[PDB]
Scaffold this active site. Sequence first.
Site, PDB file in Angstrom:
ATOM      1  N   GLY A   1      28.425  16.722  54.089  1.00 53.46           N
ATOM      2  CA  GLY A   1      28.371  15.427  53.885  1.00 53.46           C
ATOM      3  C   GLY A   1      26.984  14.433  54.472  1.00 53.46           C
ATOM      4  CE  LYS A   2      21.538  18.161  55.463  1.00 60.87           C
ATOM      5  NZ  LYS A   2      21.000  19.312  56.035  1.00 60.87           N
ATOM      6  CB  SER A   3      22.204  13.921  50.917  1.00 61.49           C
ATOM      7  OG  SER A   3      21.333  15.036  51.318  1.00 61.49           O
ATOM      8  CE1 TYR A   4      30.033   9.013  51.971  1.00 63.27           C
ATOM      9  CE2 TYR A   4      30.139   9.835  49.692  1.00 63.27           C
ATOM     10  CZ  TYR A   4      30.740   9.114  50.588  1.00 63.27           C
ATOM     11  OH  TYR A   4      31.421   8.130  50.289  1.00 63.27           O
TER      12      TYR A   4
ATOM     13  N   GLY B   1      19.734  23.279  57.167  1.00 70.79           N
ATOM     14  CA  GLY B   1      20.746  24.225  57.575  1.00 70.79           C
ATOM     15  C   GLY B   1      20.322  25.265  58.407  1.00 70.79           C
TER      16      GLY B   1
ATOM     17  N   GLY C   1      26.977  21.094  51.969  1.00 73.23           N
ATOM     18  CA  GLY C   1      28.176  20.678  51.722  1.00 73.23           C
ATOM     19  C   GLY C   1      28.901  19.906  52.763  1.00 73.23           C
TER      20      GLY C   1
ATOM     21  CG  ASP D   1      18.571  15.254  54.706  1.00 71.33           C
ATOM     22  OD1 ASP D   1      18.804  14.751  53.695  1.00 71.33           O
ATOM     23  OD2 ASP D   1      19.006  16.322  55.211  1.00 71.33           O
TER      24      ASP D   1
HETATM   25  N1  ANP Z   1      32.066  10.275  54.325  1.00 69.60           N
HETATM   26  C1  ANP Z   1      32.644  10.864  53.084  1.00 69.60           C
HETATM   27  N2  ANP Z   1      33.795  10.236  52.722  1.00 69.60           N
HETATM   28  C2  ANP Z   1      34.016  10.376  51.495  1.00 69.60           C
HETATM   29  N3  ANP Z   1      33.628  11.469  50.709  1.00 69.60           N
HETATM   30  C3  ANP Z   1      32.556  12.259  51.191  1.00 69.60           C
HETATM   31  C4  ANP Z   1      32.098  11.754  52.450  1.00 69.60           C
HETATM   32  N4  ANP Z   1      31.056  12.900  52.929  1.00 69.60           N
HETATM   33  C5  ANP Z   1      31.101  13.510  51.636  1.00 69.60           C
HETATM   34  N5  ANP Z   1      31.984  13.061  51.036  1.00 69.60           N
HETATM   35  C6  ANP Z   1      32.226  13.849  49.537  1.00 69.60           C
HETATM   36  O1  ANP Z   1      31.791  15.251  49.704  1.00 69.60           O
HETATM   37  C7  ANP Z   1      30.244  15.380  49.010  1.00 69.60           C
HETATM   38  C8  ANP Z   1      29.243  16.101  49.849  1.00 69.60           C
HETATM   39  O2  ANP Z   1      28.780  17.138  49.166  1.00 69.60           O
HETATM   40  P1  ANP Z   1      26.951  17.114  48.765  1.00 69.60           P
HETATM   41  O3  ANP Z   1      27.071  15.607  48.580  1.00 69.60           O
HETATM   42  O4  ANP Z   1      26.646  17.884  47.761  1.00 69.60           O
HETATM   43  O5  ANP Z   1      26.605  17.546  50.098  1.00 69.60           O
HETATM   44  P2  ANP Z   1      24.965  17.110  50.448  1.00 69.60           P
HETATM   45  O6  ANP Z   1      24.922  16.752  51.844  1.00 69.60           O
HETATM   46  O7  ANP Z   1      24.755  15.729  49.698  1.00 69.60           O
HETATM   47  N6  ANP Z   1      23.926  18.288  50.105  1.00 69.60           N
HETATM   48  P3  ANP Z   1      22.951  18.561  51.296  1.00 69.60           P
HETATM   49  O8  ANP Z   1      21.732  17.329  51.309  1.00 69.60           O
HETATM   50  O9  ANP Z   1      22.207  19.872  51.426  1.00 69.60           O
HETATM   51  O10 ANP Z   1      23.564  18.265  52.700  1.00 69.60           O
HETATM   52  C9  ANP Z   1      30.004  13.979  48.609  1.00 69.60           C
HETATM   53  O11 ANP Z   1      29.118  14.028  47.230  1.00 69.60           O
HETATM   54  C10 ANP Z   1      31.109  13.160  48.518  1.00 69.60           C
HETATM   55  O12 ANP Z   1      31.825  13.534  47.130  1.00 69.60           O
END
Ligand code: ANP
Lengths: 429, 441, 345
Positions: free
Chosen positions: C97-100, C251, C95, C248
């Site tokens: 913002g990593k894979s984002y 945690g 949760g 990647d």
């Molecule tokens: N820099 C950012 N700017 C705007 N929205 C963001 C940003 N980073 C994250 N978000 C939002 O928050 C969410 C992060 O949750 P999520 O993508 O499920 O975590 P994750 O990193 O992808 N899972 P994991 O690979 O285990 O870390 C994204 O899907 C976006 O909706």
Amino acid sequence: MREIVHIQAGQCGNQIGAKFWEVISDEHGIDPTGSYHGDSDLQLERINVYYNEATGNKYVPRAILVDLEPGTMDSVRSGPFGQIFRPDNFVFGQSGAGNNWAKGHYTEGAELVDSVLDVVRKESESCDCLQGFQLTHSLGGGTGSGMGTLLISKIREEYPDRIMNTFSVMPSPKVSDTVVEPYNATLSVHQLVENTDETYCIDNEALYDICFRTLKLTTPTYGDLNHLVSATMSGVTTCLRFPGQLNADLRKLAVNMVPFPRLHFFMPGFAPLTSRGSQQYRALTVPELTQQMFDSKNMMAACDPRHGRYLTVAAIFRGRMSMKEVDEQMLNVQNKNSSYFVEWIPNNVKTAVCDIPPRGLKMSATFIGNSTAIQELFKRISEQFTAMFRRKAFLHWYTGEGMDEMEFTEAESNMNDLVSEYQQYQDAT
Amino acid sequence: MRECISIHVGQAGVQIGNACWELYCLEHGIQPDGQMPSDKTIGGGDDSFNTFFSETGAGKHVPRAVFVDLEPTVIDEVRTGTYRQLFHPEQLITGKEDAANNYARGHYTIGKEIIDLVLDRIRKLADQCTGLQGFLVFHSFGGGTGSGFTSLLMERLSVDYGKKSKLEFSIYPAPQVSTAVVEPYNSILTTHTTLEHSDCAFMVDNEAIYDICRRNLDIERPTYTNLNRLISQIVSSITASLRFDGALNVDLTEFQTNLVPYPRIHFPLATYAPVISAEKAYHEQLSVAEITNACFEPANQMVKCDPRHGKYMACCLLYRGDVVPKDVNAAIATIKTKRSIQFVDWCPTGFKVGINYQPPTVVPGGDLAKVQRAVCMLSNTTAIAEAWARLDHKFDLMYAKRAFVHWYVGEGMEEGEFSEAREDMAALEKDYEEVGVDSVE
Amino acid sequence: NSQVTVAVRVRPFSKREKTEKASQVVFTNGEEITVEHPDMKQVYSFIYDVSFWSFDECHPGYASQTTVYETLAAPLLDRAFEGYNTCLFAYGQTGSGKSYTMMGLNEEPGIIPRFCEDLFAQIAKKQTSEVSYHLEMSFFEVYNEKIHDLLVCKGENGQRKQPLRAREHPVSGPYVEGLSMNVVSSYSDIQSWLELGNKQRATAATGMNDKSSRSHSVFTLVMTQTKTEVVEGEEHDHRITSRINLVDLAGSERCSTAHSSGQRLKEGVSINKSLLTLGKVISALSEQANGKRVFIPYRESTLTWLLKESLGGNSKTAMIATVSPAASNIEETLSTLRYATQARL
Ligand SMILES: Nc1ncnc2c1ncn2[C@@H]1O[C@H](COP(=O)(O)OP(=O)(O)NP(=O)(O)O)[C@@H](O)[C@H]1O
Ligand SMILES: CC(=O)O[C@H]1C(=O)[C@@]2(C)[C@H]([C@H](OC(=O)c3ccccc3)[C@]3(O)C[C@H](OC(=O)[C@H](O)[C@@H](NC(=O)c4ccccc4)c4ccccc4)C(C)=C1C3(C)C)[C@]1(OC(C)=O)CO[C@@H]1C[C@@H]2O
Ligand SMILES: Nc1nc2c(ncn2[C@@H]2O[C@H](COP(=O)(O)OP(=O)(O)OP(=O)(O)O)[C@@H](O)[C@H]2O)c(=O)[nH]1
Ligand SMILES: Nc1nc2c(ncn2[C@@H]2O[C@H](COP(=O)(O)OP(=O)(O)O)[C@@H](O)[C@H]2O)c(=O)[nH]1
Ligand SMILES: [Mg+2]
């Protein structure tokens, strides 16, 4: 109920075990048959650490003898304390290793090991709780170098959350008893740093010195060197069997003595060793044992701690004593002899005590130690290795049984890399 | 009635209990088997005192205690020794394997699946008690059991029992002396929890009692069953007002108030001044003034910290034996007249005082002497920060290289948890600087 | 040995947690990323080389997905064309913002495709006759210190996965024995091969979240600069090679709080060890530049072992931390930042 599964591997391990069971039985009060003929009750309360039970108040040991090409089954069975072992545990095969790490790891070992492990299971599940394993082998040969390490890998895969103690005889800086010692040693260390929690690097020249200088023995045989190794083997696992004031185990002596994982190569010693004449002209106290332990002559490793820094040492005492003496004398070493210790560990020594000494003494001890001087043991082989591997010396007997040249190079780097982790902590920061 | 549950974690707690109960059974008139001959001969009195010993209709007496060490090599000396027919066979051995001197084992991976029996027996012993007011605990900061099981237990008992005093008479590691090379770690992680959960954590150090045992008792080769017999006397001087009569009585809900200014500085010391030998027992008066002054000597402290490098926030003085009040109210005045002993400006009153009429008992096979009076001091000092920093520095020396840490993460631990505990230990060595400052206006 | 670069990126908010309407703990005075409890017993302050503030679309210096590329990732590309190897990491829990940030979604892209696209752009700009490039991609993981390939045998083949093993060429370095890598020509093939992989990353559903990764995913690309035949004869320095690694990580997941036994505990124990060894390696490598005789412990972990030729030498390293701005994760968030400091010093 903590329990140890002993394994013998090769001539060295078989003889050393034959002398170790002869020293644990006497310590517990067991005869060659398995019967009990003790005098105290405190020898049976924790006899489960090495011995299983049987029908007529008999006690059978948990040994697994392994030696491809026999010649020693006869020597142990015919011996005095040989008819106590389980005959189903007399594992062996034909076609001796021939002082090759390959024939004992790849060809003949691979077609015996699956029969060895099948006993470990049969001797592991019967334990209520298992603290670890105890292997006794010698680098230089083929069985102890190849087959023991293959067993170590196969057992660390199955039983990872345990201890695999391995009390290993090593080559020497002088005359040897085998020509291809360096290559087997290198290829064993590559498989003994990644799959082991505590190894004791024993050398035979340090034992000849102990027997010719202190004991003043004139004609010492191999059955007198093992009479010294068995002392350490018993002393380590005494805090499980017998009680005391500061108890211990194989895991306390592995958490404190191993700051980083690869550095688990230790440097043992036993006190009080003395000649029959000087036994009437000495006193038995804590400081005498401390001085006799930290001396560079009682160590069994063929290395001088005065050429390095102790990272962490231990002292498993045995007898009725006073911890005010023990702690004081173990702090005096750190204060006086400071340059032989490191500063990024505040205290470098722990202590363990048991209230029950040896059969004929009033106070014994047992010293473990992790020095950087083991550098000098592996800086030797890596020279011999690269004195031979360059010219492709006795190697067609290794490639000719399924081994590429790269496997010889990898084991050369890891050892060297290990040498660069001990020498990092040998000068001022 | 008044009651106190005494828990004994680890080898240190067990070896201390084996002396504490050896002393209590003799103070009350109980044989090692449980049966008292005094009740049938005299036919009266509550010498079967319910603070520690419950009673059965068969004339037997059962202690209010529990034992747990995760290693059976210790308690099996009880189940086969001289005190076997007294204690309940539920002495919670679960020692299929020990805790390897790491908090990570006593917390999660050999501390779970074992704690339920402890918290069940504690409920069983509390249901037998009407006016319970104390959960005494004996452990050591150093080892994995004392550090881990204690923190797994106090966090549970603060949920279960809550508004109920808990007291930890622990063994703080020495600066120079030590019997392990991980005590700088297992000690910091314990404070991070007991600081929030406990209420008054005493502290002893084996180096100090070693020194005491040579400069006053004339013992050059002492062992642990000599120091544990002084710790037993400390706990008896504490828990005496519960059992026996006295002019001024002091319950366990009074140390918690008259020695704990803020909830995070509840780490006092402990002393016992007359530890004099049978030879030096003569040639000496051993009056109230001598004893009270000896309690304020640095050499007689059972913890290694020069109190003259700091200030005293509070102090209690639990007398035991033939004592008169004005001897006490004359002894304390001589202390306040002295300029080496300091007191915080926010505590001029300072002293709590307690008197009892039952003198001590001389355990045979012992070194202590017979005395008509005996005292135990319980001081809160701002000096023990210098004892805490000594640990913290060691931490910083063997965490910059991340040494011995893989043996913790290998049994359910995070790296940052160590950092969080160090941050918690730094906030507390700062508050001790805040309390030590003179106000200004 | 060049310097390690460390950065931080705070996510705005998750709608899932927003049902609780929890509070904000993280604040940014330019580059001092301050953290405050709801109790305000203490106030922590962390200073790093770089800091990305993606909390809300109001503050100046907002760090859009574009802003990570030109600030941290583009120099890796610029140095890969000089022959030097590069590595990028990513450290944050579920949760964060990593894979984002690694890839994002098809509308909001991350760091991988925007990198691999400019890569092919600068190739096709310089796809002359004197030079001709060749790319090759591989994608693997680390589960309980076992190497698996995410692009082989697709499971349901009697056995589950293929535990390949690491070996050491004498001069080329460490490598994996049995990693049929792939060949690429353009960007869409990378996306196809990568979508084929991440479906097989051996994730597991812990209590905190239904999808939480238990593996350190590694994405490796290999770039070659082949030259042409000189006038005198057939010999020309056409072996200029470079290796781009993008990781990647998973945690820390402390287990006391998260009651987990059996197999997740083993996974956690394997994940906390790799992180510790990685931090030790980065600290030693950043202490070697400042002048010191220090041993870099590669061999104590597989991920640090295979990448020995990508961190040391004259290669470049980079690390991006991701933290939540909430209070519920305050014990989690702080840990990440503390690790980042250990990478900076
Ligand atoms: N820099 C950012 N700017 C705007 N929205 C963001 C940003 N980073 C994250 N978000 C939002 O928050 C969410 C992060 O949750 P999520 O993508 O499920 O975590 P994750 O990193 O992808 N899972 P994991 O690979 O285990 O870390 C994204 O899907 C976006 O909706
Ligand atoms: C009066 C007296 O002191 O007798 C001692 C003795 O003189 C010395 C020399 C004994 C003697 O041992 C030796 O001479 C010896 C010979 C070769 C190699 C090693 C030792 C002794 O034979 C050996 C024997 O030791 C034991 O009995 C212990 O139990 C020992 N186990 C065995 O010796 C043993 C071996 C095989 C079968 C049965 C028992 C032991 C050691 C460590 C841990 C557990 C047990 C003892 C006390 C003595 C004699 C008998 C003279 C010593 O033995 C040990 C290991 O402590 C040698 O140095 C010590 C110091 C003792 O003083
Ligand atoms: N005063 C006193 N201290 C003791 C005694 N026994 C052990 N200790 C202290 O306890 C510390 C060791 O930690 P312990 O908690 O006792 O170890 P344990 O109880 O066996 O639990 P493990 O650490 O898992 O072995 C040492 O530093 C000693 O100083 C004792 O009998 N009396
Ligand atoms: N201490 C001791 N060492 C031995 C004994 N027998 C052989 N060795 C050592 O073992 C090494 C040879 O290994 P070996 O026993 O032949 O192994 P194997 O070939 O696999 O059986 C040499 O260095 C010897 O010194 C013994 O009885 N005691
Ligand atoms: Mg213990």
